[PDB]
Amino acid sequence: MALPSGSDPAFSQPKSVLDAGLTCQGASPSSVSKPILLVPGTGTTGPQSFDSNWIPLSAQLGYTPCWISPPPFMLNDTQVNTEYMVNAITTLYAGSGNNKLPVLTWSQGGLVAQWGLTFFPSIRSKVDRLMAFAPDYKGTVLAGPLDALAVSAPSVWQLTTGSALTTALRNAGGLTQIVPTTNLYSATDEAVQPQVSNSPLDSSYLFNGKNVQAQAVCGPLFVIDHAGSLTSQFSYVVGRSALRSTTGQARSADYGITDCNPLPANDLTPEQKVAAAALLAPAAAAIVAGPKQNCEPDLMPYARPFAVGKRTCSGIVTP
């Protein structure tokens, strides 16, 4: 069962809009040394996801941090958020001298990266690895679209168990890794479940990926939440391993029981540590003030054939 092949799907957004969502720290994305592309979680911008963590930590490892901030706060259709990532990879690949670059993500950003790899073949040769923290490739069973209000953000419909989007990703072949991938997650994630089995049943798991459930290393009683999966010192050691590895994946030898520190990464400034612990703060107001609807967004034509029979806003998905 081959992945989608051939030409990249058309973008629904103007290219100038997509360019407007990409920023690099201290550099233009068109002339950048050793870029890393950071893809944020639902309800946040790039800086809100990563200022307290991988922006400074990647810079200290010698990368130029770059990020996308799809408006409004990653709450729009995940297929549109992916356009921002695909355009950013095209730009940063050329902008770094036509060299592959790593992609590092949090929460929704992981599914965005894997959706892009699944459906946009041009970027597969431009991404050298994926380091995904708390990704939800299967669609969580918690915090659904009809909780407390009959309307929810477009991406919340999509990142729910049973959605047409997650159905299409799995049916198109997307729960197997496409580039060398590390997925770091936690059995105690309060946003993404199920994560408890340390097996392909977990939402963060990809076949052939380096699938690191924290409790598998640190013990059954180790506790780290959805944000701590991104910010902790344990997470830094795994992510640093993945970024340095000649295999493109974190290596088990590079981390162990003595790295099982759930608190913010050692090298963050005190300000950054307090901000990292407080991560998830802005995604309350953003949600309340953002787009909301009573149905899952329609699948774009490149993805519709993989979720025939699911229901989206326009009705039943037909091929």
Q: Report the catalytic residues.
A: 107, 189, 226
Q: Provide DSSP, 242-309.
A: HHH-TTSS--GGG--GGG---SBPTTS-HHHHHHHHTTTSSTTHHHHTS--BSSPPPPPTTTGGGSTT
> Strands, DSSP E only, in the chain?
22-24, 35-39, 64-68, 101-106, 127-133, 181-185, 210-213, 311-312, 315-316
Q: Distance between CA 52 and CA 280 in Å, rounded?
A: 11
Give yes or no for a contact between 229 and 212, defined as CB atoms under 8 angstroms apart.
no
Helical axes 108-119 vs 164-171, angle rounded to 10°: 50
Give yes or no for a contact between 73 and 45, defined as CB atoms under 8 angstroms apart.
yes
Produce one character per residue of 70-109: b if its CB has 16 or more CB atoms within 10 Å, e if not.
Answer: beebbbbbbbbbbbbbbbbbbbbbebbeeebbbbbbbbbb
